[PDB]
Amino acid sequence: KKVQTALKASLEFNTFYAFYESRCPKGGLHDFQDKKCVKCGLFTYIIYDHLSQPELVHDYYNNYKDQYDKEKMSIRSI
Amino acid sequence: VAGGTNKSGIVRPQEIFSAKPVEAEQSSEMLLRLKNPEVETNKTYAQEIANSIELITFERLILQWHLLYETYSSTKKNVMYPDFASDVEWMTDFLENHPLLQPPEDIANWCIRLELNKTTMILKSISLESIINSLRAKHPNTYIMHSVENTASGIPIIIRIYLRESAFRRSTNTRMATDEKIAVNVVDKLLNS
Amino acid sequence: EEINNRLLHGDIMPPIGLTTHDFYEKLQLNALKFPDRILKPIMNSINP
Amino acid sequence: MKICKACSSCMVRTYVDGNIIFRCSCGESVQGDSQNLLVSSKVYHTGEMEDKYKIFIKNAPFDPTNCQIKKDCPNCHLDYLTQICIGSQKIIILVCRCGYMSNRG
Numbered sequence: 001k002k003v004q005t006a007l008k009a010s011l012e013f014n015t016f017y018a019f020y021e022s023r024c025p026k027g028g029l030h031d032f033q034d035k036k037c038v039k040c041g042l043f044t045y046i047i048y049d050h051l052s053q054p055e056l057v058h059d060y061y062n063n064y065k066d067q068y069d070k071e072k073m074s075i076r077s078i
Numbered sequence: 079v080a081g082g083t084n085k086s087g088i089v090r091p092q093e094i095f096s097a098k099p100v101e102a103e104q105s106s107e108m109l110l111r112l113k114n115p116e117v118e119t120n121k122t123y124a125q126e127i128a129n130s131i132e133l134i135t136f137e138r139l140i141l142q143w144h145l146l147y148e149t150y151s152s153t154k155k156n157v158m159y160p161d162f163a164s165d166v167e168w169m170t171d172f173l174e175n176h177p178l179l180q181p182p183e184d185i186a187n188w189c190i191r192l193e194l195n196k197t198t199m200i201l202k203s204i205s206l207e208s209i210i211n212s213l214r215a216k217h218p219n220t221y222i223m224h225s226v227e228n229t230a231s232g233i234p235i236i237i238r239i240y241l242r243e244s245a246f247r248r249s250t251n252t253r254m255a256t257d258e259k260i261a262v263n264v265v266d267k268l269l270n271s
Numbered sequence: 272e273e274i275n276n277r278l279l280h281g282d283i284m285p286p287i288g289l290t291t292h293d294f295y296e297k298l299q300l301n302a303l304k305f306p307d308r309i310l311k312p313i314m315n316s317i318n319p
Numbered sequence: 320m321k322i323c324k325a326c327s328s329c330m331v332r333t334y335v336d337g338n339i340i341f342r343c344s345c346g347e348s349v350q351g352d353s354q355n356l357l358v359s360s361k362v363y364h365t366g367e368m369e370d371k372y373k374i375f376i377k378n379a380p381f382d383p384t385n386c387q388i389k390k391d392c393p394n395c396h397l398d399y400l401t402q403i404c405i406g407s408q409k410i411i412i413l414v415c416r417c418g419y420m421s422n423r424g
């Protein structure tokens with residue numbers, strides 16, 4: 001049960017951060033300056049790591065979760 | 079064996095030994111080294127540069143296009159296609175939201191209506207203003223109108239490009255081209271932008 | 272199967288430059304490769 | 320097209336002073352009002368649009384060669400559904416013989 005719950009959370013975070021790797025939630029691709037995108041709050045050291053600083057991974061994810069959900073639904077339609 | 083990476087059989091050897099031109103190459107590649115030895119260390123910078131250079135023509139963002147014999151005047155009611163007469167609702171919004179982009183005085187009687195593919199606009203991460211600015215910069219002999227950037231499915235994003243009379247004045251001494259032929263040729267240029 | 276479950280729920284999102292069909296095929300080809308530890312039972316059944 | 324009211328022929332479209340004139344080979348000429356202002360059109364991704372698979376999706380629950388899935392139908396409460404995967408984006412649609420269709424269709 002713990003394995004399934006942790007795997008669900010890890011997979012969901014991995015999909016979210018693989019989607020917003022180059023794609024920017026604010027439109028276009030990321031504009032990385034000083035390790036941080038100017039348009040959004042993405043940090044370079046968070047795209048591939050979701051364990052070292054879990055507080056920051058839960059902050060960026062919470063900001064653009066909805067936008068993410070609508071985009072995910074829209075892709076899966078028509 | 080897929081198109082664009084065909085290395086099956088003896089195909090790359092034939093391209094070399096026959097001295098075939100670049101147009102006849104089915105597996106051409108290229109390796110680009112980042113100008114900054116510092117940037118080349120980090121993969122996110124390398125990944126965003128790699129996605130920065132990827133030919134997205136205006137054609138692949140389109141679901142369907144219609145070439146309409148219409149002119150736009152803001153005040154006078156001009157005739158419109160019955161299927162797209164509902165487009166007038168977002169015409170008015172565009173004019174009050176773009177007081178600097180008023181329609182010119184030399185709009186020809188030729189209109190191109192576009193219906194953007196929203197899935198490709200999401201998968202490729204292309205904003206509407208990126209398309210509009212790219213089209214306006216490359217095509218000055220046209221007038222471009224569009225709807226709002228909508229986040230709700232079922233409501234499309236419509237790109238409507240009106241041709242100015244200066245498009246036909248470019249080369250009309252070559253009389254073996256009717257106005258319909260220039261207008262269609264304008265469609266091909268705009269799509270391949 | 273876990274890739275199929277993601278597909279059925281619409282959890283598979285391809286990167287830029289790949290369609291969902293191509294990304295799903297890339298995942299399925301990678302997930303169906305034998306590990307290096309496949310020789311542990313092979314080598315335990317034989318005397319070199 | 321425009322069809323001549325006299326000989327039911329396909330008229331030729333010309334443009335004069337900002338108006339469309341359909342002229343036939345029998346001399347009859349008419350001018351289109353609104354429905355003839357469509358010079359040309361094209362639609363992309365024709366091989367994966369919903370209009371292509373309408374008959375197939377309607378017939379999917381009855382084809383015995385289609386993949387089934389162990390998932391309840393929310394309408395008739397049958398315990399299996401027919402799953403189909405259409406398009407290059409691999410769109411999954413669940414259908415039932417009662418008329419239920421995931422994606423609300």
Ligand SMILES: [Zn+2]
Nearest residue numbers: 024030037040
């Ligand atoms: Zn960003």
Ligand SMILES: [Zn+2]
Nearest residue numbers: 323326343345
């Ligand atoms: Zn006639």
Ligand SMILES: [Zn+2]
Nearest residue numbers: 392395415417
């Ligand atoms: Zn049912």
